[PDB]
Subunit: 237 residues, 4 copies
Amino acid sequence: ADTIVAVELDTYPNTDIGDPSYPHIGIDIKSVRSKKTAKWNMQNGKVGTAHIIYNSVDKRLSAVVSYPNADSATVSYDVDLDNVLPEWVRVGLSASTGLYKETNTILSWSFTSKLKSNSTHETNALHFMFNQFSKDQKDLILQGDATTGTDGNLELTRVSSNGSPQGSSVGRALFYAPVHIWESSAVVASFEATFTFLIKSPDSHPADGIAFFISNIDSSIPSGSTGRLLGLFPDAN
Amino acid sequence: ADTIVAVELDTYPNTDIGDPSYPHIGIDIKSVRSKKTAKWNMQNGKVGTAHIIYNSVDKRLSAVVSYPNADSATVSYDVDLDNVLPEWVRVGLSASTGLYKETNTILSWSFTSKLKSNSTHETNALHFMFNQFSKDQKDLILQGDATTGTDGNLELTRVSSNGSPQGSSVGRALFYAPVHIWESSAVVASFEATFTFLIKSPDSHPADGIAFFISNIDSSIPSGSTGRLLGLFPDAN
Amino acid sequence: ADTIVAVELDTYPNTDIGDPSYPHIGIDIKSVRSKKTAKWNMQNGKVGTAHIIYNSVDKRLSAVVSYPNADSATVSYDVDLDNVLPEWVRVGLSASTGLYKETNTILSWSFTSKLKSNSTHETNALHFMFNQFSKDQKDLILQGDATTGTDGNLELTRVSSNGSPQGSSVGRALFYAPVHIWESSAVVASFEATFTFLIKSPDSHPADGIAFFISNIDSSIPSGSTGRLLGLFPDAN
Amino acid sequence: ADTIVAVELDTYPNTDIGDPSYPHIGIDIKSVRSKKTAKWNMQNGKVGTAHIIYNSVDKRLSAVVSYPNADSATVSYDVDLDNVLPEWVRVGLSASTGLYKETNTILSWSFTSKLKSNSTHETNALHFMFNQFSKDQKDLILQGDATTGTDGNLELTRVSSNGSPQGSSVGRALFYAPVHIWESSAVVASFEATFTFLIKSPDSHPADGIAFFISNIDSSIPSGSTGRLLGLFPDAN
Ligand SMILES: [Ca+2]
Ligand SMILES: [Ca+2]
Ligand SMILES: [Ca+2]
Ligand SMILES: [Ca+2]
Ligand code: NI
Ligand code: NI
Ligand code: NI
Ligand code: NI
C-alpha cells in the first residue's frame, strides 16, 4: 500500500526485528528494518535537532542529530529516491509508543524543496517553516493522536493533562501541499528538512521513537503500527 | 459569499462601472469598483512583471507593474487586511475575456508569507516559486478554463490550438495550501507576491485583465463573472 | 561627516535633548533628536527582539520591539531614504554607556536587502544571518569596545570578567560588505532587519541604549559619542 | 601561495597537461590537472547555467552544467574541503583567453552558504544574488581585465567595443565578504552556487574557459596564468 522512506530516531532497541542494542538513528527504505543505522546517545528530557538532506546528483540520504553541548550522530545511505518514491509526495513526522512510552513533542519544523530545470534560471521551490503550532493549523494534516496548540507545540502522541505520555499511541502530521520531487526536465532536485524535538519519559526505557518520512500523497497510518512500527509500517518485514 | 481582496491589471476601460478611460492597475477590496487605480501603459505582446507587497505594521497594500525598458506604474492603498479577510486564506491568480479577448498567460509566480510572533525568533513562513508549470501540477487548484503545461506556462483563459485567445472565458489557479495571515501572538505579518505575465491580443481592444487575489479558502468562480468581473465578483456593485 | 539613519532602543531619558520621560524606541534621521518615538516598556535582564522594515514604494521606516509574554512597542516614520543616504551603505549595530551603564549584548542578527529592477526577474539580493558570533568573525567590522565570541555573543560595550557592564563605553559592529540600496533601474528596493538583544544592568537606571543603523560605508565612531549619543552622533543637535 | 578549489568549464583541450580531447567540466583541487572531468558539449553563443553543490556530511563536490533543450553534463568528486581550504575563504569566478579566445560573460550569479551548529536552531547563513551588475559594483573585488556594467553583465576577460573577445586576457571577480566554511561547533556546513554564462567566439576553437573557485581570502591572479591556467594556477603542475 504506502511507499515510505523515513529517517527514524528510534529510542527502543527491538533486536528481534534488527535494531541494534541501543537508541539509534536509521534510514528506512520501505521497511522498518533500517538499511543503515548509527548509535544515538539519546538524552531524556533534552531538546534535540535533526537535519536531513538529499539531492538527486549524489543520491545519498544523510541525517545528523545533535543535542546542545554534545557530539552529534550522523547516518548516510546511497539511494536513488526517483526509483523508490512517486514524483509527487507528502512529507511528514510520525511517532508512536507501545507498552513503553515517551512524549514525542515537536517544537519547530522547516522544509525546503528545490527543482532546478535546464531552462536558464527555471527554479521551482517550496519552503515552509513552523516555529509555533496553533490549535487549528489548517496547513497540516494530523492523523491518529497528533494534536497542535498545546504550549504552541505539536504533540505527535497522546499526553494526558498532567504532562504524562500515554502508551499504545500513534500520530502523524503531514504538510498539506504535495511536494514535487522529480520532473522530466530537472537537472538537480534537492530537499533539506530540520526539526527540533523533546522526547521525555518518566521511565528508564522510553519507546518508541520519532521519524521524519516522505510518502505517497494519500498515505494514512497502517492498522496496528503503534509501538515498534512507528506509525509507518504495517508489519516488521 | 466570498471575501476578495485583489490587485487587478485591467486591460479594458468599463467606464460605466467606474474604470478610468485607459488600462489601469487597481486595488479591489470586496468590489470590482477599485478603491484606487493608476494608469497602466499596457504593452500588447510583451512580458510584464507585477510585484505586490503588504505588512501588518503599515497596513498599506502596494503593487508595482513594469515592462522591460519602460517606466513602471504603481498604486497603493491603506487598508488593514485583518479587518477584511479571515486569518486563513488561499492566494491565487484570476483572469477573464468577454466580447473582447486576450491570452492571460502566466510564465512564473512566487509568493512569500511571514508571521513573526513575540516569542524570541518565532517565525512561521511559507514560500513557493514556480518558474515552470507542468500538466499535472498537484499543488495548484485550477478552476474554470485555466490549464498548465502548455509550453510550461499557466494559461488562465482558453486559447485555441493556433494560439488564439477565446472570448467569454474565465479561469483561476490557487496555491493548494491555506496561508496563515493573522495569529494572536504575531507582532508583524507580511507577504510579497511576484508574477510575470504575457497578455497578447490580435485586436486593438484587449479585454479583460488579470488579477492577483486573496480569498476565503473555499472561494470558487462566481456565476457569470466572465468579462469585466474578472472571475472574482458576482456583480458590479 | 557621516550620514546616519538609525532606529534607537533608548534606555535612558535625556529630556534636555528631547527624549520623552521613559525608555523609548525612536527613528533618528541624521540627529539624536528622534523624529518619532514610542514608549518602550524595557525589561532589565530579559531577551528582546527588534524588527525593522522599509521599502522604496511606501517610503516608511517602521520598527517593532517585543519581549516574550509582553505586548510590543512599534514606531513608524515616513521618510524617503534615497533622499538621505548614499546608494551604497553599510548596516550595523551600535551601543553605549556613560555615567549609567548596562550590558548591550546581541545574541543574533539577520538582514535581508532586495533590489528588484524592471528587467523581467532581475532581483539582486543580499542576506546574512548570525545566530552565533565567533572570536574572529571576519565578516564583521568591529569598532570601539565591541567584541565577539564571549559565550558566542556579540558584546557591543565593555563588560568586565565578572559579567559587569562598564560605564563610558562605545562599540559598533558593521557587516563587512557594502549594501546596494538604490540603482537607476530598480522598481522596488526593500530591507528587513531583525536582532535579539539582552540589556542587563545592576542599577535601577540603565543607560544608554542600542541602535540599528545604516550609514555611509566608511562611517567610524564620532569622538565623544559615549553616553547619550549612542556611538552615532558627534553632538546633540 | 594560494589554495584553490575550482570547478572549471574548460573550452580548450590541452592534452599535454591532462585535459581530455574535448571541452569538459572538471574539479580542480590545487592543480589545473583536474581530479575528475566529464565531457561537456559546449554551445558557442548560447547561454548556459552551472550549479555547484557541496556539504560537509557527504564531502562530495558536484557540478551540473546545462544549456536549454539539451542534456546536461555532471561531474562529482569526493573531497573533504576542511582538509584543503582555510575556515574563512572568498568565492569567485575566473576566466582567461590565450592565443585562442572567447567572451567569458556572466549574466547572473548566486551563492548560499550555511553553517548549522549544535546549539538548537543556530544557523549562520550568507546569501547573495546578482541578476544584474552595475559599473561600480562595490561588493565585488574585480581583478585583472574583469569589468561590470556593460549591458549590466560581468565581463571576465577583455572584449573590444565591436563585441570582439581579445586574446591573452585574464580577469576574476570575488564577492567582497569572507565566507565562513568551518567552525568548531558546526554539525553541517553546506554551499550552493549557480551562475549563467555566455561563451561566444568568432573561431572554431574557443579558449580557455570559465571557473567558479574558492580560495584563501587574499588570493590574487598568479603571474602568467592567462591561457590554459585559467587565471587560477601559477603553473601546470
Ligand atoms: Ca525500535
Ligand atoms: Ca475593466
Ligand atoms: Ca537617551
Ligand atoms: Ca584547457
Ligand atoms: Ni530501529
Ligand atoms: Ni478596473
Ligand atoms: Ni531617545
Ligand atoms: Ni581541463
